Amino acid sequence: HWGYGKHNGPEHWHKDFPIAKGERQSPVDIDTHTAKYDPSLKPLSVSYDQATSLRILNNGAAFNVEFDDSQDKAVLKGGPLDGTYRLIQFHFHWGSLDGQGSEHTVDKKKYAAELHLVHWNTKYGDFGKAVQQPDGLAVLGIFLKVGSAKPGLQKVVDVLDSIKTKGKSADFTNFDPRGLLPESLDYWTYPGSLTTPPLLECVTWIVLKEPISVSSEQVLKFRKLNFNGEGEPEELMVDNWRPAQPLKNRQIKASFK
Ligand SMILES: Oc1ccc(SSc2ccc(O)cc2O)c(O)c1
Numbered sequence: 199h200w201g202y203g204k205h206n207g208p209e210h211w212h213k214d215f216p217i218a219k220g221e222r223q224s225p226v227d228i229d230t231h232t233a234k235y236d237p238s239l240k241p242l243s244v245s246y247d248q249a250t251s252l253r254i255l256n257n258g259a260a261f262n263v264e265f266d267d268s269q270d271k272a273v274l275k276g277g278p279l280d281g282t283y284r285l286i287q288f289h290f291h292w293g294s295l296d297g298q299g300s301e302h303t304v305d306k307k308k309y310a311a312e313l314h315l316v317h318w319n320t321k322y323g324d325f326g327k328a329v330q331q332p333d334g335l336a337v338l339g340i341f342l343k344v345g346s347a348k349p350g351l352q353k354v355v356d357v358l359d360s361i362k363t364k365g366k367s368a369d370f371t372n373f374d375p376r377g378l379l380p381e382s383l384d385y386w387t388y389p390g391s392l393t394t395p396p397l398l399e400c401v402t403w404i405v406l407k408e409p410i411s412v413s414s415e416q417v418l419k420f421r422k423l424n425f426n427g428e429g430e431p432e433e434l435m436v437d438n439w440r441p442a443q444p445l446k447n448r449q450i451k452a453s454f455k
């Protein structure tokens with residue numbers, strides 16, 4: 199019964215999920231002046247040309263666009279990663295106001311939202327096994343700022359009315375996640391966790407430096423979603439983000455000078 203309210207939000211999660219106070223929790227603040235350029239990192243390869251989206255689901259915490267991951271149709275390779283990581287889903291975290299909503303921060307700056315493209319390491323055979331491994335997932339994080347509209351987001355925005363409440367899903371075929379990427383793949387990377395319960399410490403984070411711009415109308419449509427199920431008191435799905443957690447004994451590496 200975890201959530202994002204005062205009574206069940208991030209400050210409470212550690213009681214059911216003690217790993218919340220673990221050594222590699224996410225998100226973190228990215229201090230750009232202490233992250234170090236790593237010339238050892240190989241180029242990042244985002245290969246999404248054969249992606250097969252299936253469905254979109256309101257799970258009561260966010261909405262997930264879900265992909266067919268039964269073959270290497272959309273994969274992430276390179277950068278800090280060894281081997282091949284398959285796209286399974288993406289989701290966002292966002293705010294009630296344009297000045298908050300992201301999970302990662304950059305020199306303490308909060309963006310309006312943050313996209314998480316979730317990929318699992320194919321050496322572990324499926325997602326459920328991958329999340330039990332320290333290198334099981336690679337999550338590509340992309341910041342959203344409010345400005346110009348993002349055409350590649352509009353198909354997502356326009357289906358949200360059909361999944362307003364928790365447990366609702368809809369068909370969502372033929373969506374191209376390449377339309378959600380910025381021009382540059384410059385990134386920061388560090389080892390961390392899921393930012394929601396169960397908070398598993400299985401993620402190589404790859405957070406892009408360049409935000410995408412989305413329009414005020416696009417983000418407003420995210421804010422009309424509901425945390426509740428149909429036939430329950432309405433609580434708007436906003437501020438579904440966890441604040442920054444202690445970096446502890448981790449280093450953030452940059453792919454760029
Ligand atoms: O092999 C597949 C199994 C499940 C899905 S649903 S996405 C999905 C994946 C992980 C989640 O914790 C939540 C999600 O909604 C999928 O797309 C493929």
Ligand SMILES: OSc1ccc(O)cc1O
Nearest residue numbers: 314316337391392393394
């Ligand atoms: O970032 S929160 C989060 C939740 C589920 C997941 O499979 C991956 C994630 O990174």
Ligand SMILES: [Zn+2]
Nearest residue numbers: 289291314393
């Ligand atoms: Zn997330």
